[PDB]
Structure formats: structure tokens, C-alpha cells
């Protein structure tokens, strides 16, 4: 048996930010759609569409891009609703970007985030997607089986 979802969590509102120069907008878009689909069919409630389309940013602007995109997306929601998930596409080798990302999301924005390496965005294998869905589920309060 592979791990599966016991209780599927809910992602009604999400956005994507891309930090890889090898990834065009449409590919980030397509990647997130496949991930959203996997999350759903695994047992989550997961909106097939993001609050805002993906945006591409330079790692040097991590603080600015995250805070601005967070503000703009949140202001788009019905009053009192909040963003459930940020999906981040990042370069295979990213130095301090991963850590910066997590510190900002954890301690300033208070948003759940899922990082995805460029290599996986190009391959988009079903096994990868299933694994990332499992991680997302736990992060938003769902529960998975144990082996």
C-alpha cells in the first residue's frame, strides 16, 4: 500500500508565484492545474482556478513579490476569507530563496506554502503530483495514512 488521504483538507483560494527563469507563465499555469487536479481526485476540496494568475519574480524580490501578491489576492476575496495556499516554483539550486520564502510565509504572512523544483515542473509525473498532494493535505489540516 502507498500512502493515501484519510481526511481531505480544503483549498478554496490559492495563488502561484514563480522564481524560475526557465518557466513561462503558461507552464506554471499548467503545472498548478495538474497539481490542483491531483489534490482533488485524492480527496481534497481544491479550487481548479487560482485567485490570481501566476506571477514571475526574481529571487532578489522575494519579500516584495510575496507581500504584494498576498495583499492583492487577499483583497480580491469575499470579506473575511483568506488565501489557503501559496504554490512556489523555484530554481533547482536557489541558495537562500527557500529559507527566505519559508520565513516570510511562516512568520510575516501566516500562509501555507508548497515549494516545487523546476525539474519537477517540466516532468509533471503523476507520482510526483501524488506526493505533493499528500504534503499539501497535511499542511492545510487534512490527515494521511501511515505505512
Helices (H), the chain: 25-42, 62-75, 97-104, 118-123, 126-139
Taking the least distance from each CB to ligand 5GP, the nearer of 42 and 94 is 94
> Whole-number minimum distance, CB 94 to ligand 5GP, in Å?
6
**Do the beta carbons of residue 139 and residue 114 sit within 8 Å?**
yes
Taking the least distance from each CB to ligand 5GP, the nearer of 22 and 76 is 22
Taking the least distance from each CB to ligand 5GP, the nearer of 13 and 94 is 94
Site residues for ligand 5GP per CB under 6 A: 90, 94, 98, 113-115, 117, 135
> Whole-number minimum distance, CB 113 to ligand 5GP, in Å?
6
> Whole-number minimum distance, CB 72 to ligand 5GP, in Å?
22
Q: Which residues of 62-85 are buried (b: 16+ CB within 10 A; e: fewer)?
A: beebbeebbeebbeeeeeeeebbb
SS3 state of residue 59: helix
Amino acid at each position: 500500500s502507498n500512502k493515501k488521504m484519510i481526511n481531505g483538507g480544503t483549498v478554496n483560494n490559492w495563488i502561484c508565484i514563480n522564481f524560475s527563469r526557465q518557466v513561462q507563465d503558461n507552464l506554471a499555469r499548467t503545472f498548478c492545474q495538474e497539481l490542483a487536479q491531483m489534490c482533488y481526485v485524492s480527496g481534497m476540496a481544491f479550487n481548479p482556478e487560482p485567485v490570481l494568475p501566476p506571477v514571475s519574480a526574481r529571487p532578489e524580490q522575494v519579500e516584495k513579490v510575496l507581500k504584494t501578491r498576498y495583499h492583492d489576492a487577499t483583497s480580491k476575496l469575499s470579506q473575511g476569507k483568506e488565501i489557503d495556499l501559496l504554490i512556489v516554483i523555484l530554481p533547482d539550486n536557489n541558495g537562500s530563496l527557500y529559507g527566505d520564502l519559508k520565513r516570510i510565509c511562516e512568520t510575516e504572512l501566516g500562509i501555507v506554502s508548497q515549494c516545487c523544483l523546476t525539474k519537477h515542473v517540466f516532468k509533471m509525473s503523476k507520482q510526483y503530483m501524488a506526493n505533493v498532494a499528500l504534503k499539501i493535505n497535511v499542511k492545510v489540516g487534512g490527515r494521511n495514512t501511515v505505512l
